[PDB]
Symmetry: none
Subunit: 41 residues, 2 copies
């Protein structure tokens, strides 16, 4: 069974998608506090 | 009381940011481990 590399490929794909969501959400938080600094004049 | 609240909100966004970079690092080490 050469599924080992296929499993590995998916597991890497899951982590890539996971990272994407975190990086995008992280950007929203940075933007959120910047907006707060703006709103605080 | 109001000016102290403004500080706290900025500390929370930091608590959240650090915890995200933490998860990114966890995801990174897991990814490296899948690459053997």
């Amino acid at each position: 069974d050469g599924l080992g590399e296929e499993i590995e490929a998916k597991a890497k794909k899951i982590l890539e998608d996971y990272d994407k969501q975190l990086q995008h959400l992280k950007k929203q938080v940075e933007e959120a506090k910047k907006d707060f600094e703006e709103w605080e004049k």
